[PDB]
Design an enzyme around this catalytic site. Sequence first.
Site: not given
Lengths: 211, 220
Positions: B15, B180
């Site tokens: 996000a 990641h």
Amino acid sequence: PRAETFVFLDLEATGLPNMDPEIAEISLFAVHRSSLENPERDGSLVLPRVLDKLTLCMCPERPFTAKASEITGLSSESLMHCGKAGFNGAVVRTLQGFLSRQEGPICLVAHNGFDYDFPLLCTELQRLGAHLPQDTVCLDTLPALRGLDRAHKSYSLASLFHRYFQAEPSAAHSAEGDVHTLLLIFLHRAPELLAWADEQARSWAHIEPMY
Amino acid sequence: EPPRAETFVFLDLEATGLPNMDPEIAEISLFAVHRSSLENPERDDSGSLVLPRVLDKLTLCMCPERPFTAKASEITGLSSESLMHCGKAGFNGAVVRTLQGFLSRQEGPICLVAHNGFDYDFPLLCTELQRLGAHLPQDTVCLDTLPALRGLDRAHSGRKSYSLASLFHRYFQAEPSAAHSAEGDVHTLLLIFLHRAPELLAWADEQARSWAHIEPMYVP
């Protein structure tokens, strides 16, 4: 126009010996042209950060051969066990949603695509009356890499990968794994293949089904 | 009382920031796993967990309507410019069609699984879906592995942190091979789940929450 997104794909199927082929797994990696024009490196290649992916398993009605069950690691009974239907309307809706998320025009990329993946995909879609965007084109890396080498051996993914990257692909033997390996191979010769695509990519509408 | 779920759909969001700035989804990844893969975790001959072979995957990148924070761009490795360079639209109808198709391919009922999901991922997904008037299948439930694991450890009895990375390090004593990224974090989550699968399945069977009871993080 040039294709803006390259959608790398691989299909695993059964029932070909019956000429009743039925997809068991499909994997797609969608990559924008810019990512291929300008490859990322850590010194070795790494996949683009902005990468859409779709992998769907399907229980085929026909069984795998034991040779293609050891490699892919699927069984028709096991796909059923994990509760998967066949290639159906839901697969089509997901795939079309996925492709609409890509900036067009789309170039489908598959190793040995003209002889296997593309006509097989075409047969399943036509069975369901499903169409891809009419500006879609496609690219088979097998004749491309042969063609390129002639402009100056084994042409399997395994062999190609070993010849370009010194080592064996730790990518699992699956559709997804095979697309991973293919994308890296493509990246390793990307300017040549992008050039091949611009001049040699075939209209998807030309692709004929198995049937 | 929650229904018994037949497919566990592991998901992570990347996000644009923290709740206070009304964040947006820039990436969503989902791994769909049949319950039976979780009930009998497959292990290689060396005896370590491996991912289930019958595994549906969906990863989609999206350009947010509003910018990233500096920290979120760093964490996620995404920026508005890069997503725009790659021709990605925002969270739109096409995203919903793809997600709903994907979920319809799963044997229900579905249990959504997300780490810290009750505080972040689920309310964020709820906001984005509600903005477009989108609905998930009716009997869908949710599991958050953070309170689940804390609760299991309190009953069973270290260690302090219940962050995704901390849990993976504790359980596997190695760095995740993740990128990641949303997909890498789902991969890490599924392995954590598998490490304690029977406990977490039991937890889900009795504690999983109705998706319909999830509230949006904010009004878009």
